């Protein structure tokens, strides 16, 4: 088990944690997670997960230019995208109750609700309060006590 | 348009195709493939592959700044990296017998031997003579029969 695989497992754990503080308007039987864009640490998510409450997280890659990301995804995990592509992605998410998390987040002021920082001894993450308010989903404010 | 799963599966087969025009100075029992940097299309690769002679290809992700890539890897499948990370990777491979293939078709100017173009109806690729010559492996020129017939409607 090398440190990319170990960081990937940790990435899984962190997302599961974050999920426990989010609520969807109409809660689905299976939580759809979409991995979108190039990613380095998503191989654990893609093996599928299960929440403490029993609900299954089904994970799948989807293309950046997939117009239906808003209706196909409950959670999106966003990898490397350029400017045109990210506002392409979020145009598809606008109007829908979707939790968004990006694998890299140097500053996290535009785009995803949450931005991981996977480098370093432990995984940390930042929260985008605007994104969270315009999100469609409900975020228990306790989750901010879990961020940097 | 082609799906992410479809494209992933095809990348597997194009890599198997390329591997068959490549000879290593000391062929290993198990071909070691390393996926480095963020990738969209490597999930097929990472299941492990098998060559037509029955040699297994073992795949795993490694960190961009791992100093021993040239030692740990027979093959590098390279994802999205910045200017400095790319310099790090290809300096790590200098002097070792390593095949390098990029997921995207921009890295053929900067050190990758083959560069995939995953857009379109089929997967095409391009190659760089300079990078190939300094690679330490031997590549048969027929490998372009595979890019040409792929670039064909
Ligand atoms: N090592 C190769 C070098 C080479 C010549 N022409 C090529 C065309 C494509 C790829 C490699 C080559 C050889 O057998 O000579």
Author numbering:
A (entry chain B): 38 to 185
B (entry chain A): 38 to 190
The study reports:
The YfiBNR system contains three protein members and modulates intracellular c-di-GMP levels in response to signals received in the periplasm. YfiN is repressed by specific interaction between its periplasmic PAS domain and the periplasmic protein YfiR. YfiB is an OmpA/Pal-like outer-membrane lipoprotein that can activate YfiN by sequestering YfiR in an unknown manner. Previous studies suggested that in response to cell stress, YfiB in the outer membrane sequesters the periplasmic protein YfiR, releasing its inhibition of YfiN on the inner membrane and thus inducing the diguanylate cyclase activity of YfiN to allow c-di-GMP production.
Moreover, we found that Vitamin B6 (VB6) or L-Trp can bind YfiR with an affinity in the ten millimolar range. Structural analyses revealed that the VB6 and L-Trp molecules are bound at the periphery of the YfiR dimer, but not at the dimer interface. Interestingly, VB6 and L-Trp were found to occupy the same hydrophobic pocket, formed by L166/I169/V176/P178/L181 of YfiR, which is also a binding pocket for F57 of YfiB, as observed in the YfiB-YfiR complex. The over-expression of YfiBL43P induced strong surface attachment and much slower growth of the yfiB-L43P strain, and as expected, a certain amount of VB6 or L-Trp (4–6 mmol/L for VB6 and 6–10 mmol/L for L-Trp) could reduce the surface attachment. In E. coli, mutants with decreased tryptophan synthesis show greater biofilm formation, and matured biofilm is degraded by L-tryptophan addition. Based on our results, we concluded that VB6 or L-Trp can bind to YfiR, however, VB6 or L-Trp alone may have little effects in interrupting the YfiB-YfiR interaction, the mechanism by which VB6 or L-Trp inhibits biofilm formation remains unclear and requires further investigation.
